[PDB]
Design a protein around this ligand. Structure first.
Ligand SMILES: *[C@@H]1O[C@H](CO)[C@@H](O[C@@H]2O[C@H](CO)[C@@H](O[C@@H]3O[C@H](CO[C@H]4O[C@H](CO)[C@@H](O)[C@H](O)[C@@H]4O[C@@H]4O[C@H](CO)[C@@H](O[C@@H]5O[C@H](CO)[C@H](O)[C@H](O)[C@H]5O)[C@H](O)[C@H]4NC(C)=O)[C@@H](O)[C@H](O[C@H]4O[C@H](CO)[C@@H](O)[C@H](O)[C@@H]4O[C@@H]4O[C@H](CO)[C@@H](O[C@@H]5O[C@H](CO)[C@H](O)[C@H](O)[C@H]5O)[C@H](O)[C@H]4NC(C)=O)[C@@H]3O)[C@H](O)[C@H]2NC(C)=O)[C@H](O)[C@H]1NC(C)=O
Ligand SMILES: *[C@@H]1O[C@H](CO)[C@@H](O[C@@H]2O[C@H](CO)[C@@H](O[C@@H]3O[C@H](CO[C@H]4O[C@H](CO)[C@@H](O)[C@H](O)[C@@H]4O[C@H]4O[C@H](CO)[C@@H](O)[C@H](O)[C@@H]4O)[C@@H](O)[C@H](O[C@H]4O[C@H](CO)[C@@H](O)[C@H](O[C@H]5O[C@H](CO)[C@@H](O)[C@H](O)[C@@H]5O)[C@@H]4O[C@H]4O[C@H](CO)[C@@H](O)[C@H](O)[C@@H]4O[C@H]4O[C@H](CO)[C@@H](O)[C@H](O)[C@@H]4O)[C@@H]3O)[C@H](O)[C@H]2NC(C)=O)[C@H](O)[C@H]1NC(C)=O
Ligand SMILES: *[C@@H]1O[C@H](CO)[C@@H](O[C@@H]2O[C@H](CO)[C@@H](O[C@@H]3O[C@H](CO[C@H]4O[C@H](CO)[C@@H](O)[C@H](O)[C@@H]4O)[C@@H](O)[C@H](O[C@H]4O[C@H](CO[C@H]5O[C@H](CO)[C@@H](O)[C@H](O)[C@@H]5O)[C@@H](O)[C@H](O[C@H]5O[C@H](CO)[C@@H](O)[C@H](O)[C@@H]5O)[C@@H]4O)[C@@H]3O)[C@H](O)[C@H]2NC(C)=O)[C@H](O)[C@H]1NC(C)=O
Ligand SMILES: *[C@@H]1O[C@H](CO)[C@@H](O[C@@H]2O[C@H](CO)[C@@H](O[C@@H]3O[C@H](CO[C@H]4O[C@H](CO)[C@@H](O)[C@H](O)[C@@H]4O)[C@@H](O)[C@H](O[C@H]4O[C@H](CO[C@H]5O[C@H](CO)[C@@H](O)[C@H](O)[C@@H]5O)[C@@H](O)[C@H](O[C@H]5O[C@H](CO)[C@@H](O)[C@H](O)[C@@H]5O)[C@@H]4O)[C@@H]3O)[C@H](O)[C@H]2NC(C)=O)[C@H](O)[C@H]1NC(C)=O
Ligand SMILES: *[C@@H]1O[C@H](CO)[C@@H](O[C@@H]2O[C@H](CO)[C@@H](O[C@@H]3O[C@H](CO[C@H]4O[C@H](CO)[C@@H](O)[C@H](O)[C@@H]4O)[C@@H](O)[C@H](O[C@H]4O[C@H](CO[C@H]5O[C@H](CO)[C@@H](O)[C@H](O)[C@@H]5O)[C@@H](O)[C@H](O[C@H]5O[C@H](CO)[C@@H](O)[C@H](O)[C@@H]5O)[C@@H]4O)[C@@H]3O)[C@H](O)[C@H]2NC(C)=O)[C@H](O)[C@H]1NC(C)=O
Ligand SMILES: *[C@@H]1O[C@H](CO)[C@@H](O[C@@H]2O[C@H](CO)[C@@H](O[C@@H]3O[C@H](CO[C@H]4O[C@H](CO[C@H]5O[C@H](CO)[C@@H](O)[C@H](O)[C@@H]5O)[C@@H](O)[C@H](O[C@H]5O[C@H](CO)[C@@H](O)[C@H](O)[C@@H]5O)[C@@H]4O)[C@@H](O)[C@H](O[C@H]4O[C@H](CO)[C@@H](O)[C@H](O)[C@@H]4O)[C@@H]3O)[C@H](O)[C@H]2NC(C)=O)[C@H](O)[C@H]1NC(C)=O
Ligand SMILES: *[C@@H]1O[C@H](CO)[C@@H](O[C@@H]2O[C@H](CO)[C@@H](O[C@@H]3O[C@H](CO[C@H]4O[C@H](CO)[C@@H](O)[C@H](O)[C@@H]4O)[C@@H](O)[C@H](O[C@H]4O[C@H](CO)[C@@H](O)[C@H](O)[C@@H]4O)[C@@H]3O)[C@H](O)[C@H]2NC(C)=O)[C@H](O)[C@H]1NC(C)=O
Lengths: 49, 414, 48
């Protein structure tokens, strides 16, 4: 199971047990995010289909 | 200065409106030291003495370019211009302060006719050089910091010099190849940003802040970066303060009529565009002009107008400058008593420039809206109580250029 | 989605004195900061 802080390194490197030395780690997280929109000036006009 | 024609760019037997960095007032001083703030200088030397001028900032820097000009006594004008960095330096002195020159863009020696003034001016990162017969240009980086000016010359040795702050508008009259008069508008407000004088070969003068000169495009819009392009930026005439009225008529794509008063040089050819220019104020009380635009196609006329309602039947207006509510625009035409109308689009939030090509295309703010087949003349019917609607009306032709775009504007031109 | 640039990151306000463009990109196509056109304030964009 990939839950523990050390159980995630193996789960990321696809390996059962790891050697000694330095390793690179960066754990992302999938979620939902708000959205922003900035554009050059123009007026607003809408339609529905 | 009461100086040569080519140093100003005016033809024979005419009276133009020249704008830019120009010298106004001479000095006669003997204090031998005074630190000024300026952007250029003019001087005349005929005396037998050592005279030198120099431009510098307020503090030492080892990565800065310092201009330095030194005249030398002879039979002609011996001039030594040097533009480069300096090591441990000087307090001040004539005749080559310090030979610490190690990476110099320009290091020359001039021998020109005695009795002719010289000058150096700075605009952005561009350094000009007037020489009474030619106008050179160098591109030295980080040259907008050079604000101070350390002038050192004496009056008894036949030495008078002027100095420039900024952007003076003048009125120069020429006759038989010599300038006759030189007067400065205390009136004539706003002329410094919309009026210039066309140089030789139909070029556009350097150091002109492009106010409402947009980049024409068929697709997307450029935002930043240097981009080689192909734009109509070579004039054949210019009509300053036209004062178009409601009873003028048509204009026929050539400046050989009876009402055209070109400014500066004026060739004769056939043009491709007609760049208009709109004069508007910040307030929005009388920026709502009632009128139409009448084209002239080979078969039938086309009528263009805009309104603020979806059913464009009860109004006919064209706004200038900023607005507050959307406006819709239409097109009218007739084919055997059959009035046909269609919807074209919506004006941008601020209308400032209008361009009409000759092959049919019609641009607003540098964006195509529709396209006719072939246009012969344009009648800009606007009802107004005075002559204040437009700044200039310029004819142009397509020419390959190189543009430094910043924030959807034009900085330089080459 | 800022001037036809897409990605992710945190947008914070700041106050710097810069005149010129309204988009400062790196040499690898990523944004580093834009500028509201109707004022002079800029903004900073960094990955999280
Ligand atoms: C800068 O750019 C400017 C814009 O281009 C430019 O200025 C303009 O340049 C144009 C290009 O050259 C130029 O156009 C030419 O104009 C000639 C002038 O003719 C008219 O004026 C003379 C008197 O000077 C007159 O005798 C003649 O009949 C023409 O009068 C016109 O009559 C029309 C009606 O018939 C009339 O239309 C109606 O008018 C009403 C009022 O009366 C009312 O307003 C109506 O609403 C309106 O529809 C029109 O208004 C009037 N025009 C004037 C000015 O009074 C044209 O002759 C010339 O066309 C001929 O030449 C071209 C080639 O150049 C040919 O291709 C073309 O087919 C024409 O050839 C024949 O021409 C004759 C007339 O000459 C026609 O009729 C014959 O007439 C004979 C007797 O005269 C005889 O009866 C015959 O049987 C008739 O058939 C004939 O049909 C034509 N075709 C054929 C196959 O034969 C051309 O259009 C324009 O004038 C310039 N000026 C402007 C626009 O103000 C400027 O030059 C540029 N700058 C520089 C430096 O270059
Ligand atoms: C958005 O997209 C749209 C898409 O359409 C774009 O619209 C197009 O825009 C282009 C750009 O203008 C249009 O293309 C043509 O441009 C010509 C410009 O002429 C220049 O440049 C060309 C390009 O290399 C040169 O080959 C020319 O020689 C000329 O060179 C210039 O520089 C030289 C440097 O030394 C000088 O020596 C020259 O003198 C010159 O200054 C125009 O001329 C084209 O117009 C032609 O067609 C018109 C309609 O057919 C004619 O009316 C017109 O005649 C004009 O000139 C005579 C001269 O007396 C006048 O009397 C007329 O009244 C009129 O004013 C031109 O006629 C040429 O073509 C016909 C038809 O082929 C020939 O029969 C003529 O003999 C004449 O010669 C040309 O063709 C012959 C071959 O037949 C060649 O041998 C000769 O060398 C000539 O090339 C035209 O405008 C293009 O048409 C536009 N699209 C459409 C659909 O119209 C927009 O621009 C885009 N927007 C943006 C912002 O980009
Ligand atoms: C404006 O900027 C200029 C820089 O461009 C500043 O310098 C002035 O530059 C002007 C020329 O652009 C100078 O004007 C000339 O002044 C000459 C002075 O010469 C006398 O003095 C010198 C010593 O200073 C001496 O060596 C010499 O021998 C003279 O004694 C004038 O000579 C000249 O005008 C005179 O000559 C013209 C035409 O003469 C030609 O033809 C003759 C044959 O007819 C021939 O013999 C000559 O050799 C020559 O080839 C003549 O038409 C003039 O007539 C005037 O007077 C009548 C009335 O009698 C009048 O109707 C007419 O319109 C003329 O006004 C005259 O006899 C030039 O004017 C000026 O001197 C320079 N200034 C200084 C201080 O040096 C200038 O300072 C700037 N000004 C300001 C206000 O900022
Ligand atoms: C800024 O201004 C000037 C810019 O040039 C600076 O230098 C001064 O320049 C003036 C004009 O040149 C000088 O005035 C005369 O200078 C003559 C020298 O000529 C030179 O230049 C000519 C070309 O023009 C050249 O050909 C020549 O070879 C030289 O190189 C002097 O000769 C002349 O002296 C005359 O006057 C004296 C009397 O003057 C004294 O006494 C007065 C009271 O009586 C008093 O008011 C005066 O102020 C002064 O103290 C006269 O004795 C001389 O005649 C003698 O010689 C003849 C033979 O030639 C003999 O026959 C006779 O019996 C006498 O024995 C002569 O007629 C002028 O001085 C001025 O001198 C320059 N200044 C200095 C300090 O030298 C000026 O310095 C600058 N200002 C500052 C503050 O720095
Ligand atoms: C600004 O104004 C100043 C003056 O304030 C102008 O300076 C002078 O302007 C005068 C005319 O405006 C010039 O006179 C001209 O002289 C020419 C002859 O010069 C020849 O020889 C000299 C050497 O001595 C040489 O350097 C030069 O290049 C020439 O080869 C004449 O050509 C000219 O007009 C003559 O021709 C016209 C007809 O012109 C038509 O036909 C031409 C083809 O032949 C064609 O190219 C033209 O475009 C045009 O379509 C003719 O009508 C003239 O007749 C005159 O004389 C009769 C009496 O016989 C009289 O009735 C009539 O009314 C005319 O007065 C003439 O034969 C000029 O005469 C003078 O040279 C200028 N001086 C200087 C120093 O420049 C200055 O030019 C103006 N600025 C500009 C940009 O023009
Ligand atoms: C780009 O657009 C901008 C838009 O603002 C424009 O800026 C303005 O430009 C004008 C220059 O034209 C600036 O100057 C103003 O001029 C006013 C002129 O007043 C005289 O004329 C009045 C009417 O004349 C018009 O109408 C007649 C027909 O009636 C027509 O023939 C004329 O040609 C002209 O079109 C007239 O009312 C007035 O006095 C009359 O009435 C009295 C009775 O009251 C009578 O006794 C008189 O005999 C006479 O008949 C006068 O004769 C001037 O009034 C105005 O002054 C106001 O503003 C100044 C400055 O703010 C104040 O100090 C002052 O107290 C007034 O409130 C002003 O001087 C004008 O200032 C510009 N606007 C701004 C905001 O700067 C640009 O010029 C355009 N660019 C180009 C190139 O055109
Ligand atoms: C000959 O060559 C020199 C360069 O080699 C050209 O330009 C000079 O460049 C130097 C730097 O390389 C400039 O040096 C400056 O000196 C100032 C001293 O100014 C004196 O004069 C003013 C008024 O005339 C007095 O107020 C002042 O007290 C001095 O007596 C310094 O003020 C500058 O740095 C110091 O001040 C700044 C603040 O401005 C501090 O921040 C610094 O830490 C430091 O304390 C600066 O170093 C020099 O001004 C330039 N001009 C001249 C004439 O030397 C010359 O143009 C070139 N040609 C000639 C004819 O000299």
């Amino acid at each position: 199971y990939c839950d523990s802080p050390f159980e995630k390194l193996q789960c990321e490197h696809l390996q059962f047990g790891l050697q000694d030395g330095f390793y690179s780690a960066n754990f992302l997280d999938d979620n939902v995010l708000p959205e922003t929109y900035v554009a050059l000036p123009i007026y607003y006009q809408h339609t529905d289909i | 200065a009461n100086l040569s024609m080519l140093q100003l760019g005016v033809p024979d037997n005419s009276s133009t409106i020249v704008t830019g960095l120009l010298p106004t007032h001479w000095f006669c001083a003997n204090q031998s030291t005074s630190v000024y703030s300026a952007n250029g200088f003019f001087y005349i030397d005929v005396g037998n003495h050592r005279s030198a001028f120099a431009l510098h900032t307020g503090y030492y820097d080892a990565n800065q370019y310092y201009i330095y000009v030194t005249n030398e006594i002879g039979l002609n004008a011996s001039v030594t211009l040097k533009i480069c960095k300096f090591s441990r330096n000087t307090t001040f002195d004539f005749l080559s302060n310090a030979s610490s020159s190690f990476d110099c863009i320009v290091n020359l020696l001039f021998t020109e006719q005695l009795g002719a003034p010289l000058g150096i001016t700075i605009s952005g990162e561009t350094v000009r050089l007037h020489l009474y017969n030619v106008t050179r240009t160098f591109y030295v980086p980080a040259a907008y910091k050079l604000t101070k000016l350390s002038v050192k010359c004496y009056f008894n040795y036949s030495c008078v010099f002027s100095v420039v702050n900024a952007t003076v508008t003048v009125n120069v009259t020429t006759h038989n190849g010599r300038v006759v008069n030189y007067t400065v508008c205390d009136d004539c407000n706003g002329y410094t940003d919309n009026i210039f004088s066309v140089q030789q070969d139909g070029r556009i003068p350097n150091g002109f802040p492009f106010n409402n000169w947009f980049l024409l495009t068929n697709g997307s819009t450029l935002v930043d970066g240097v981009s080689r392009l192909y734009q109509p930026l070579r004039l054949t005439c210019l009509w300053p303060v036209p004062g178009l009225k409601s009873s003028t008529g048509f204009v026929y794509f050539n400046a050989t009529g009876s009402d055209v008063n070109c400014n500066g040089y004026q060739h004769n050819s056939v043009v491709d565009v007609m760049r208009y220019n709109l004069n508007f104020s910040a307030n929005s009380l009388d920026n709502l002009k009632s009128g139409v635009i009448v084209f002239k196609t080979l078969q039938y006329d086309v009528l263009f107008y805009c309104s603020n309602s979806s059913s464009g039947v009860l109004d006919t207006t064209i706004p200038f400058g900023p607005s507050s509510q959307p406006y819709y625009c239409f097109i009218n035409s007739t084919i055997n008593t059959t009035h046909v109308s269609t919807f074209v689009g919506i004006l941008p939030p601020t209308v400032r420039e209008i361009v009409v090509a000759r092959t049919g295309q019609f641009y607003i703010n540098g964006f195509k809206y529709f396209d006719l087949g072939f246009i012969e003349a344009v009648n800009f019917n606007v009802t107004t109580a005075s002559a204040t609607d437009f700044w200039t009306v310029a004819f142009a032709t397509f020419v390959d250029v190189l543009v430094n775009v910043s924030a959807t504007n034009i900085q330089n031109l080459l | 989605n800022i001037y036809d640039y897409v990605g992710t990151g945190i947008i914070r306000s700041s106050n710097q004195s810069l005149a010129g463009g309204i988009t400062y990109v790196s040499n690898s196509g990523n944004l580093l900061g834009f500028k509201n056109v109707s004022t002079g304030n800029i903004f900073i964009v960094t990955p999280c």
